[PDB]
């Protein structure tokens, strides 16, 4: 691939920063492409382009906007397999995942918001015969989205779909680890008829390009997906610069509670899907699995059985369902967590090492890893690993497990396995998390708002509420009576 | 003098463990109203633990049980309106003619409004397929903190605490160090109304310490702040860096008042007066850039002079007084520096511009009502919020021009237009970059109407149904009744 | 008491019909009172009064209306016991019910709507830069409620609360069987500050006073509670006369489904409360109880045990929990249904006869009655009895009981008893009823919309939606661009 | 000539078993366009069992699957716009200049609108206490019936079927016996888009038989009817008497157009023209009572006559034709009876009042554009809907008077005001008793905007989000997780 350029105002354009970076294929170590990095002057160009495109976009009818987003949806469906293969090359996720999930659910959200544009309404409030109020849900203007590397094009769609549907232009910065699919999406939008400037894509690094966006005085909102620490830095700079509105989708340490009446085959299946999809690189993963003491030994055997069925290998093979981690530096961090678990006395049930042999020595592979006999003070239990590392924790009673599930600064997701009507709702209602699954894990419908409690996030994505949160309310009073001054 | 004022934690007054105190002054006389204890770091932690325990009791009650308790507080506030207004006048220097008609009346209106909406707070249900559906809960945030400003102390305490409590939260409120007294009275009223202990705690103190300890505390889920634009940026930064708190910010503005070429100039002048000189100019939404057509500027200036001459400064408890001192001598000094900036930058002084002198004024920080004209967009008095009684009059030629100039600011709080024309009123208002827009009026802020700033003037909103919802957090719950399939 | 008069424009006034009727105390057979009947001229006077009052009422602020309704609530709480005693004399329901339910839940709904008045808002819809639409939710004007006799004051509150909260005036006609508490409510409203004419009460008979209301050209909506047959007459006349909006809360034959995993003590408690409260005179009663064949014998035993604890007697006694039927003519109809059950081959498990002895010979008593071995073709199974008659039906599988529960023209309520998460939601989602209870029966929160599918009703009561349904939408387009004529 | 037209049941054309047929006439020539089979009792029974089967398949699909199928129907309607418009012109007599720009365009706009809203159709969740909560489902009604009118045949079929299908129902549509042809084309288009067989069935026939059989059928859950005020009352009665069906009714009106004393009279004249002579006056919302201030009446009359003189009747397929014949010869007879009453009751005829004559008109149901003035509130032409091209001009003196006279009617469908004044426009409109109100325009009916009548002009609404919800029924579900308490 040739020097990948910036995408500004409906065309690829060379960056004026003079800086570049490389994205690596995590399966081979090869350079996928050299990518231009947006400089401070490039960000300002992108903002002025976005201001001009947004005015055209907002002036269109609601249904005209809806039709253009729907054309982008149709193109995404057509190009699913091509885009999935590129995503696999950039992220290391198996094609069996990227071709079935990444673009499908990204497009599902764009399709959803495309249809809701005409339903975006203000309100009207009578005060008295001589005065009333009405409100408008106006675009914020130019907004910025900052993506993460685990679901690059899905995240770009989940941020840009409500932003565009609400009448804004978005400047999107993909993660430096995985910048390629965002640039393809930018071409797809314009091909669908999106006006020039409404979706600009600026590859770059967080310390420079990301910061230039968070500081710009004419960007009205920042939406960020990433780690808890990076989020705090982003939200601070966005505030100190121009008091921007903020959305944050950060990591978690989500609990999966297995009830005493749970079927352990189902619970083990849910625990598997909550830990080893995308090689464990999912913010919502149920990485603390609480199991009753009386069932723990049997559950551990059922986990070992299923871990043995995991099929690592060629990411383009049909039967491969486990990939390398997104990068070699990230594998290093995941390995440090694994060593921490060993040094603190957690019992390694399986995995714990890199994969070796033909087809693995050149990739950032980590074996599916399960620790058991875990306790609430362990580093692997307290901190998000963002790798394929399950922690199993024994518990005795329902009140106890609720307290321990909630005793964390994280708040993203949670789940319970139980056939009992009262227990399922009763437990779920007490858990301090924004995304809660009963007898399942991971499904995130376009209709369902998702985001974190406590340190796991600010605001929400998806659902009707996220379309409204990309508008700002203007209240208008019409006074038809005589105005009275006290002077 | 009043008795020494303590912290209010868990349904009773309690001594601070900081060992620190400050004084609140009567802005009209300079006398010490009271010595006030300042909450330390340990006091904030005690307040948070009290709030956590109270919130659980409050949230477990029925919706209508909560509604009835807030309504009892409303009834008390109506009965004690005049007494609370007199205290507010002593602490702020605002005339009783204002405080007895606006401050508690509109604060209680918002509490009364939210009290009735508690039972209407609902989540959603979304079918996915025959075998699965989603439902959502609007759950309390938990413990939230409000940080008040000094210009409308008890109104702000009510506008923040009413939706927070109605949504099932406990709130720790920190009043401005300038004006702590009515917030402590409000805490007693809530308890008398039946609010569980800990649900509304009040921590007087100074911003550098008590305010910071609240924004840093790991177990406070949301900060709501009212104040200046600069102070706002600092609060929002500390709230994010510490524990990623949800935030609401109601900051200042430089709001434009646009007088159309077809406006009646008596109405326009009355609106401009009320948009600049209420509460002695100490109002975030004031219309401090008055745009008038060139052809009408001379006549408009004359009508402003007539009305400014009628402003009545004097005894703040007298019925005919409608203008008070500024809240402090340091704040007046800043307003005086802006006025001197207007003179040196070439704006024409139409009236006022000086401190008030003589018996009854020497002990207060009074500034005469001030009007500048012949102003231009580059002047400091036109670009920056003064927060004093200083009107800037700007001439303009055409509608496209005035919309551009009205919007060419980092502020975004309020705006208004004066015109009898249907098309012009809606057409102009729709293009203005502000959250609060008034047509042929100024200042009215109904409990139903969400209010807040665009751009640097704010984050989020207050009042209206949406502010009840914004004090909850959404939990989405998927019920999967079909057999779960694992790909491993 | 005296000769009960009409209530028009804030005062008691003599009827101009020249006609009266009597309401009987169902416990003694004695005449409680003679009540004047509103004629066609009385209805026209009530309507003109309502038009005048509604204009005053709607011109008030929203919070002014809220406070007045709240004062009525405070009065109702204070006079709960007094009002309940009057209700017991008129209806025959035990004081243990009327003092705990009738006024309490009537007032709860009024209290609920009082608080929602300020939240009643229209909408605003941008079309293009030069045109927008806004809507107003305007009062209907004058509406009429026609109450039933089983819950006289509760029904008066449930109809009048949303109607008044929406800015309307209501003319209320109580059932001729039970007119007394409705007149008390009219006094309470005026004492609370309700403008004269906003709530007028016209006692009379359905054949005359009710028909005059449904025919009046200046009444905008009729809300009716009663039997299915009477409802069809009312809704037709409302259509033929002036095309009125209509709400109908009619009877049902609601199924109670006991699952194979149900606790039979719980199922029996639910079945008892679903059949014998208010002596079986409740539209929502679960009068078809479906029980699995394998448990039928045990369930019947548990029902008989609980039936033996039912305490009929002095309606003002604390421990009395069962009363006479509302009238002797109604008892005659209930007895005919019981004899049909006997003759069609249903097995009589208990009851089936009037009660005899000192204190019962003078009242319209029917013993708690249970039939079992019932089949879907029996008259007692297909038709609403509106008396204390439980029908127990055996079933074998889940698909069958859903088909049989739904195989009816009625659609009011339904319920299931089961501890299983999937079974509770799965079954309830398939039942064709508007009011569904899981592991409970009867609770009707002010927040919860209630009403019938199929022949059991039109529209809903309670919930936010019922406040909205007492307004009518006006859409207003503001065209700020130049209008183009093609002529 | 066209082939004999059959019923459309379960995804295919099928012969009626009634043994009866009727003819639809081309109103421009008097010729038979087609012979059309009429559905009997048994045909209606068969259509219902088909609809019951199809609805189950349709409702079981996901929301977005339903959305995509309706969007494909939209795409076909856009592609086939001109062909469908030409057929509508043949059946109705409306000029192609109208049908190709409005009828299918706005019909498809509403289908497109509801297609996108399907995934947003949500129930509610209500917490009661920690141990119990309520949630609601918005379930399909099942099989619903739509009964169309003849003035906008395919638009009405789309406005009724779009929310009904989008909400998960099947609809059986009966077109007017006057204009059955475009509804049958719509049924084929729906199937081509993937609509499951049975979800949209079409039963041509006459009101006394096919219409009544539908309103009486026990397994139809809701009836939506558009037509005349009298026919509506009969439909609503039979629907109640049979099985207590939910009802929607869009009936006629006598809508007032109020010209204010400050109105520009050219704008007022253009609005009045569009409010009276579009579709040859056959529009339920037409502004047939034009209220003009006395001081402007003579001049207003002159501007109306000038614009009436520009009306171009002729070949309905010509670009410049903008006026057509009435839909049928019996309908012209009724319009002529109303015109004669206006003359006999003393109203002044300004123009028109007779049929059009000559080559190209003698065989069509033509009535000249007609304007009466000096009208009074007691005249038959002022009190009753004519549904032809007859404008009544009424003088007035003051605003209170015209509001009272505008409202002094049993009709309530639409209304409008012409004024440049902000206060006058909103003030007057807020007092008018009509569901559809236009300020400085007439006739536009956005898919987003609920429309329907006050008083005798209707029950319920069409279009907007509320109409999607009104084609569902609410089920409230209480989950009790606490121990149930029996008093027995
Ligand atoms: N929830 C998470 C956790 C980590 N990450 C990514 O992994 C990197 C390494 O993780 P930490 O910086 O959290 O140690 C982050 O900088 C970020 O790029 C993420 O994108 N989302
Ligand atoms: N919008 C504003 C602006 C200023 N202020 C007050 O004024 C101070 C700023 O100093 P001056 O207003 O004296 O220039 C703030 O720290 C705050 O106490 C406020 O409370 N709200
Ligand atoms: N659901 C029901 C059923 C009957 N009823 C009353 O009972 C009458 C008919 O029932 P009976 O034939 O049992 O007397 C109705 O006209 C009405 O007065 C009622 O008010 N609600
Ligand atoms: N609003 C209206 C008024 C009349 N009509 C049609 O006109 C008929 C009434 O006869 P005339 O209109 O020919 O007088 C109705 O039965 C109906 O076919 C309509 O479809 N909509």
PDB file of N, CA, C and O and ligand atoms in Angstrom, chain C residues 147-150 175-177 224-230 249-252 282-284 327 329-331 333-334 336-337 384-387 412, ligand 3:
ATOM      1  N   UNK C 147     -70.025   5.786  34.764  1.00  0.00           N
ATOM      2  CA  UNK C 147     -69.394   4.869  35.686  1.00  0.00           C
ATOM      3  C   UNK C 147     -70.167   3.583  35.866  1.00  0.00           C
ATOM      4  O   UNK C 147     -71.328   3.465  35.492  1.00  0.00           O
ATOM      5  N   UNK C 148     -69.500   2.618  36.482  1.00  0.00           N
ATOM      6  CA  UNK C 148     -70.090   1.350  36.868  1.00  0.00           C
ATOM      7  C   UNK C 148     -70.308   1.333  38.379  1.00  0.00           C
ATOM      8  O   UNK C 148     -69.892   2.244  39.106  1.00  0.00           O
ATOM      9  N   UNK C 149     -71.007   0.298  38.851  1.00  0.00           N
ATOM     10  CA  UNK C 149     -71.431   0.253  40.240  1.00  0.00           C
ATOM     11  C   UNK C 149     -70.494  -0.522  41.149  1.00  0.00           C
ATOM     12  O   UNK C 149     -70.640  -0.429  42.373  1.00  0.00           O
ATOM     13  N   UNK C 150     -69.532  -1.266  40.605  1.00  0.00           N
ATOM     14  CA  UNK C 150     -68.695  -2.084  41.482  1.00  0.00           C
ATOM     15  C   UNK C 150     -67.615  -1.257  42.192  1.00  0.00           C
ATOM     16  O   UNK C 150     -67.255  -1.572  43.330  1.00  0.00           O
ATOM     17  N   UNK C 175     -73.463   5.010  38.040  1.00  0.00           N
ATOM     18  CA  UNK C 175     -74.474   3.978  37.901  1.00  0.00           C
ATOM     19  C   UNK C 175     -75.651   4.292  38.813  1.00  0.00           C
ATOM     20  O   UNK C 175     -75.478   4.787  39.935  1.00  0.00           O
ATOM     21  N   UNK C 176     -76.855   4.019  38.303  1.00  0.00           N
ATOM     22  CA  UNK C 176     -78.073   4.185  39.082  1.00  0.00           C
ATOM     23  C   UNK C 176     -78.079   3.313  40.325  1.00  0.00           C
ATOM     24  O   UNK C 176     -78.730   3.665  41.315  1.00  0.00           O
ATOM     25  N   UNK C 177     -77.327   2.213  40.310  1.00  0.00           N
ATOM     26  CA  UNK C 177     -77.223   1.356  41.483  1.00  0.00           C
ATOM     27  C   UNK C 177     -76.467   2.057  42.608  1.00  0.00           C
ATOM     28  O   UNK C 177     -76.777   1.862  43.789  1.00  0.00           O
ATOM     29  N   UNK C 224     -66.744   5.125  29.116  1.00  0.00           N
ATOM     30  CA  UNK C 224     -67.751   4.233  29.677  1.00  0.00           C
ATOM     31  C   UNK C 224     -67.101   3.011  30.291  1.00  0.00           C
ATOM     32  O   UNK C 224     -66.184   2.427  29.714  1.00  0.00           O
ATOM     33  N   UNK C 225     -67.574   2.642  31.478  1.00  0.00           N
ATOM     34  CA  UNK C 225     -67.197   1.401  32.145  1.00  0.00           C
ATOM     35  C   UNK C 225     -68.476   0.630  32.448  1.00  0.00           C
ATOM     36  O   UNK C 225     -69.440   1.206  32.961  1.00  0.00           O
ATOM     37  N   UNK C 226     -68.494  -0.654  32.107  1.00  0.00           N
ATOM     38  CA  UNK C 226     -69.676  -1.468  32.329  1.00  0.00           C
ATOM     39  C   UNK C 226     -69.554  -2.789  31.593  1.00  0.00           C
ATOM     40  O   UNK C 226     -68.453  -3.220  31.259  1.00  0.00           O
ATOM     41  N   UNK C 227     -70.712  -3.423  31.347  1.00  0.00           N
ATOM     42  CA  UNK C 227     -70.729  -4.707  30.674  1.00  0.00           C
ATOM     43  C   UNK C 227     -70.547  -4.600  29.165  1.00  0.00           C
ATOM     44  O   UNK C 227     -70.791  -3.565  28.539  1.00  0.00           O
ATOM     45  N   UNK C 228     -70.132  -5.719  28.566  1.00  0.00           N
ATOM     46  CA  UNK C 228     -69.799  -5.727  27.141  1.00  0.00           C
ATOM     47  C   UNK C 228     -71.005  -5.312  26.304  1.00  0.00           C
ATOM     48  O   UNK C 228     -70.892  -4.487  25.392  1.00  0.00           O
ATOM     49  N   UNK C 229     -72.180  -5.860  26.615  1.00  0.00           N
ATOM     50  CA  UNK C 229     -73.364  -5.551  25.822  1.00  0.00           C
ATOM     51  C   UNK C 229     -73.729  -4.077  25.942  1.00  0.00           C
ATOM     52  O   UNK C 229     -73.883  -3.380  24.931  1.00  0.00           O
ATOM     53  N   UNK C 230     -73.835  -3.575  27.177  1.00  0.00           N
ATOM     54  CA  UNK C 230     -74.146  -2.164  27.387  1.00  0.00           C
ATOM     55  C   UNK C 230     -73.139  -1.263  26.686  1.00  0.00           C
ATOM     56  O   UNK C 230     -73.497  -0.182  26.203  1.00  0.00           O
ATOM     57  N   UNK C 249     -64.162   0.583  28.929  1.00  0.00           N
ATOM     58  CA  UNK C 249     -63.568  -0.398  29.837  1.00  0.00           C
ATOM     59  C   UNK C 249     -64.680  -1.383  30.185  1.00  0.00           C
ATOM     60  O   UNK C 249     -65.531  -1.089  31.032  1.00  0.00           O
ATOM     61  N   UNK C 250     -64.675  -2.543  29.549  1.00  0.00           N
ATOM     62  CA  UNK C 250     -65.767  -3.497  29.642  1.00  0.00           C
ATOM     63  C   UNK C 250     -65.322  -4.706  30.464  1.00  0.00           C
ATOM     64  O   UNK C 250     -64.317  -4.657  31.177  1.00  0.00           O
ATOM     65  N   UNK C 251     -66.135  -5.762  30.446  1.00  0.00           N
ATOM     66  CA  UNK C 251     -65.841  -6.955  31.213  1.00  0.00           C
ATOM     67  C   UNK C 251     -64.863  -7.872  30.509  1.00  0.00           C
ATOM     68  O   UNK C 251     -64.352  -7.586  29.426  1.00  0.00           O
ATOM     69  N   UNK C 252     -64.600  -9.013  31.153  1.00  0.00           N
ATOM     70  CA  UNK C 252     -63.719 -10.014  30.598  1.00  0.00           C
ATOM     71  C   UNK C 252     -64.040 -11.390  31.143  1.00  0.00           C
ATOM     72  O   UNK C 252     -64.902 -11.553  32.013  1.00  0.00           O
ATOM     73  N   UNK C 282     -65.578  -7.884  39.802  1.00  0.00           N
ATOM     74  CA  UNK C 282     -64.407  -7.164  39.302  1.00  0.00           C
ATOM     75  C   UNK C 282     -64.201  -7.560  37.846  1.00  0.00           C
ATOM     76  O   UNK C 282     -64.131  -8.751  37.531  1.00  0.00           O
ATOM     77  N   UNK C 283     -64.081  -6.560  36.963  1.00  0.00           N
ATOM     78  CA  UNK C 283     -64.010  -6.843  35.535  1.00  0.00           C
ATOM     79  C   UNK C 283     -62.807  -7.707  35.181  1.00  0.00           C
ATOM     80  O   UNK C 283     -62.882  -8.497  34.238  1.00  0.00           O
ATOM     81  N   UNK C 284     -61.695  -7.550  35.907  1.00  0.00           N
ATOM     82  CA  UNK C 284     -60.425  -8.202  35.612  1.00  0.00           C
ATOM     83  C   UNK C 284     -60.275  -9.569  36.268  1.00  0.00           C
ATOM     84  O   UNK C 284     -59.197 -10.165  36.188  1.00  0.00           O
ATOM     85  N   UNK C 327     -76.968  -5.957  44.227  1.00  0.00           N
ATOM     86  CA  UNK C 327     -78.412  -5.805  44.143  1.00  0.00           C
ATOM     87  C   UNK C 327     -79.047  -7.177  44.006  1.00  0.00           C
ATOM     88  O   UNK C 327     -78.397  -8.143  43.597  1.00  0.00           O
ATOM     89  N   UNK C 329     -81.604  -7.958  41.882  1.00  0.00           N
ATOM     90  CA  UNK C 329     -81.688  -8.334  40.457  1.00  0.00           C
ATOM     91  C   UNK C 329     -80.396  -8.928  39.925  1.00  0.00           C
ATOM     92  O   UNK C 329     -80.439  -9.844  39.088  1.00  0.00           O
ATOM     93  N   UNK C 330     -79.243  -8.411  40.379  1.00  0.00           N
ATOM     94  CA  UNK C 330     -77.965  -8.959  39.940  1.00  0.00           C
ATOM     95  C   UNK C 330     -77.742 -10.352  40.507  1.00  0.00           C
ATOM     96  O   UNK C 330     -77.266 -11.246  39.800  1.00  0.00           O
ATOM     97  N   UNK C 331     -78.097 -10.564  41.777  1.00  0.00           N
ATOM     98  CA  UNK C 331     -78.004 -11.907  42.334  1.00  0.00           C
ATOM     99  C   UNK C 331     -78.823 -12.892  41.510  1.00  0.00           C
ATOM    100  O   UNK C 331     -78.408 -14.039  41.308  1.00  0.00           O
ATOM    101  N   UNK C 333     -79.386 -12.886  38.312  1.00  0.00           N
ATOM    102  CA  UNK C 333     -78.601 -13.252  37.139  1.00  0.00           C
ATOM    103  C   UNK C 333     -77.438 -14.167  37.509  1.00  0.00           C
ATOM    104  O   UNK C 333     -77.146 -15.128  36.786  1.00  0.00           O
ATOM    105  N   UNK C 334     -76.755 -13.882  38.622  1.00  0.00           N
ATOM    106  CA  UNK C 334     -75.634 -14.726  39.025  1.00  0.00           C
ATOM    107  C   UNK C 334     -76.107 -16.142  39.324  1.00  0.00           C
ATOM    108  O   UNK C 334     -75.442 -17.120  38.962  1.00  0.00           O
ATOM    109  N   UNK C 336     -78.676 -17.711  38.019  1.00  0.00           N
ATOM    110  CA  UNK C 336     -78.981 -18.410  36.773  1.00  0.00           C
ATOM    111  C   UNK C 336     -77.720 -18.985  36.141  1.00  0.00           C
ATOM    112  O   UNK C 336     -77.748 -20.087  35.582  1.00  0.00           O
ATOM    113  N   UNK C 337     -76.608 -18.243  36.194  1.00  0.00           N
ATOM    114  CA  UNK C 337     -75.352 -18.782  35.681  1.00  0.00           C
ATOM    115  C   UNK C 337     -74.910 -20.007  36.476  1.00  0.00           C
ATOM    116  O   UNK C 337     -74.403 -20.974  35.902  1.00  0.00           O
ATOM    117  N   UNK C 384     -69.041 -13.835  31.025  1.00  0.00           N
ATOM    118  CA  UNK C 384     -68.725 -13.163  32.277  1.00  0.00           C
ATOM    119  C   UNK C 384     -69.928 -13.243  33.206  1.00  0.00           C
ATOM    120  O   UNK C 384     -71.055 -12.897  32.824  1.00  0.00           O
ATOM    121  N   UNK C 385     -69.676 -13.699  34.430  1.00  0.00           N
ATOM    122  CA  UNK C 385     -70.737 -13.871  35.424  1.00  0.00           C
ATOM    123  C   UNK C 385     -70.823 -12.646  36.315  1.00  0.00           C
ATOM    124  O   UNK C 385     -71.923 -12.233  36.705  1.00  0.00           O
ATOM    125  N   UNK C 386     -69.671 -12.049  36.616  1.00  0.00           N
ATOM    126  CA  UNK C 386     -69.597 -10.901  37.505  1.00  0.00           C
ATOM    127  C   UNK C 386     -70.166 -11.261  38.871  1.00  0.00           C
ATOM    128  O   UNK C 386     -70.869 -10.478  39.510  1.00  0.00           O
ATOM    129  N   UNK C 387     -69.849 -12.468  39.317  1.00  0.00           N
ATOM    130  CA  UNK C 387     -70.154 -12.902  40.656  1.00  0.00           C
ATOM    131  C   UNK C 387     -69.062 -13.827  41.151  1.00  0.00           C
ATOM    132  O   UNK C 387     -68.101 -14.121  40.435  1.00  0.00           O
ATOM    133  N   UNK C 412     -59.447  -8.779  28.481  1.00  0.00           N
ATOM    134  CA  UNK C 412     -59.136  -7.743  29.459  1.00  0.00           C
ATOM    135  C   UNK C 412     -57.811  -7.995  30.166  1.00  0.00           C
ATOM    136  O   UNK C 412     -56.881  -7.187  30.076  1.00  0.00           O
TER     137      UNK C 412
HETATM  138  N1  LIG E   3     -68.056  -6.127  33.611  1.00  0.00           N
HETATM  139  C1  LIG E   3     -69.286  -5.805  33.983  1.00  0.00           C
HETATM  140  C2  LIG E   3     -70.369  -6.709  33.789  1.00  0.00           C
HETATM  141  C3  LIG E   3     -71.589  -6.311  34.182  1.00  0.00           C
HETATM  142  N2  LIG E   3     -71.782  -5.078  34.738  1.00  0.00           N
HETATM  143  C4  LIG E   3     -73.127  -4.636  35.187  1.00  0.00           C
HETATM  144  O1  LIG E   3     -73.985  -5.760  35.166  1.00  0.00           O
HETATM  145  C5  LIG E   3     -75.023  -5.567  34.160  1.00  0.00           C
HETATM  146  C6  LIG E   3     -75.279  -6.880  33.471  1.00  0.00           C
HETATM  147  O2  LIG E   3     -74.917  -7.962  34.317  1.00  0.00           O
HETATM  148  P1  LIG E   3     -75.990  -8.977  34.901  1.00  0.00           P
HETATM  149  O3  LIG E   3     -76.691  -9.556  33.685  1.00  0.00           O
HETATM  150  O4  LIG E   3     -75.170  -9.953  35.739  1.00  0.00           O
HETATM  151  O5  LIG E   3     -76.911  -8.120  35.753  1.00  0.00           O
HETATM  152  C7  LIG E   3     -74.483  -4.442  33.276  1.00  0.00           C
HETATM  153  O6  LIG E   3     -75.486  -3.752  32.552  1.00  0.00           O
HETATM  154  C8  LIG E   3     -73.752  -3.570  34.286  1.00  0.00           C
HETATM  155  O7  LIG E   3     -74.686  -2.803  35.035  1.00  0.00           O
HETATM  156  C9  LIG E   3     -70.704  -4.207  34.931  1.00  0.00           C
HETATM  157  O8  LIG E   3     -70.912  -3.096  35.449  1.00  0.00           O
HETATM  158  N3  LIG E   3     -69.469  -4.598  34.534  1.00  0.00           N
END
